[PDB]
Amino acid sequence: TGIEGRKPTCDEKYANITVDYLYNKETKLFTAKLNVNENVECGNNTCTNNEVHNLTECKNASVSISHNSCTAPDKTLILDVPPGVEKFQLHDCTQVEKADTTICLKWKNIETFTCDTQNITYRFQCGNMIFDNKEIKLENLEPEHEYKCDSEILYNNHKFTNASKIIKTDFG
Ligand SMILES: *[C@@H]1O[C@H](CO)[C@@H](O)[C@H](O)[C@H]1NC(C)=O
Ligand SMILES: *[C@@H]1O[C@H](CO)[C@@H](O)[C@H](O)[C@H]1NC(C)=O
Ligand SMILES: *[C@@H]1O[C@H](CO)[C@@H](O)[C@H](O)[C@H]1NC(C)=O
Numbered sequence: 001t002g003i004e005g006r007k008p009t010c011d012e013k014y015a016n017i018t019v020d021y022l023y024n025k026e027t028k029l030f031t032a033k034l035n036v037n038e039n040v041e042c043g044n045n046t047c048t049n050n051e052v053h054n055l056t057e058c059k060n061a062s063v064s065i066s067h068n069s070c071t072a073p074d075k076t077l078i079l080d081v082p083p084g085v086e087k088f089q090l091h092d093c094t095q096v097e098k099a100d101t102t103i104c105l106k107w108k109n110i111e112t113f114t115c116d117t118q119n120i121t122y123r124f125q126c127g128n129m130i131f132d133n134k135e136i137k138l139e140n141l142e143p144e145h146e147y148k149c150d151s152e153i154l155y156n157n158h159k160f161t162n163a164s165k166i167i168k169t170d171f172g
């Protein structure tokens with residue numbers, strides 16, 4: 001209305017910018033989607049449609065972010081890329097003799113990755129119960145019920161993969 005608003009630094013405007021990781025199974029590479037409304041500019045590497053493409057799993061990549069609405073210095077964003085989605089398998093560990101009263105689900109690490117495992121979190125939702133662990137086991141379940149158990153894997157609190165398992169408390 002009056003005086004033109006002071007432009008912030010791009011490092012100021014995008015200091016807390018978030019990213020979503022989208023795996024391409026064909027290329028075995030990740031795309032980082034920048035969670036911003038405006039069409040941002042990236043130096044040197046391109047970020048067409050606010051996406052940084054062809055990122056190798058478990059490797060840090062840096063992207064300098066700017067826009068006309070903000071001044072220098074650029075926001076230097078470190079992309080801590082997660083492990084490949086095909087390196088994890090959701091396995092049903094339920095013992096067949098106890099299938100009527102138990103659920104056992106476990107994520108299996110089917111191939112090695114260099115990312116630190118301390119930043120890897122596994123979450124499960126069976127019914128409406130939420131678990132945080134690589135493996136979950138429920139016992140004393142009432143027979144003849146059906147549950148949709150949803151699970152996701154986070155890297156630095158970033159969901160990069162997920163899967164579902166429908167389990168019945170019976171023998172077949
Ligand atoms: C990304 O990878 C794909 C598949 O390997 C390739 O066709 C493309 O040229 C790469 N480069 C960019 C910037 O998308
Ligand atoms: C990768 O990025 C994270 C976050 O910035 C950092 O803490 C870590 O030191 C980096 N890894 C290496 C090998 O420098
Ligand atoms: C490890 O991962 C957590 C997320 O679970 C992250 O917040 C933290 O910065 C990381 N710590 C180290 C020492 O790499």
Ligand SMILES: *[C@@H]1O[C@H](CO)[C@@H](O)[C@H](O)[C@H]1NC(C)=O
Binds near residue numbers: 150151162163164
């Ligand atoms: C997996 O993630 C997608 C979004 O990436 C979401 O639409 C879906 O509901 C998720 N849940 C499961 C368990 O597949």
Ligand SMILES: [Hg+2]
Binds near residue numbers: 089090091092
């Ligand atoms: Hg399996």
Ligand SMILES: [Hg+2]
Binds near residue numbers: 086111
């Ligand atoms: Hg493989």
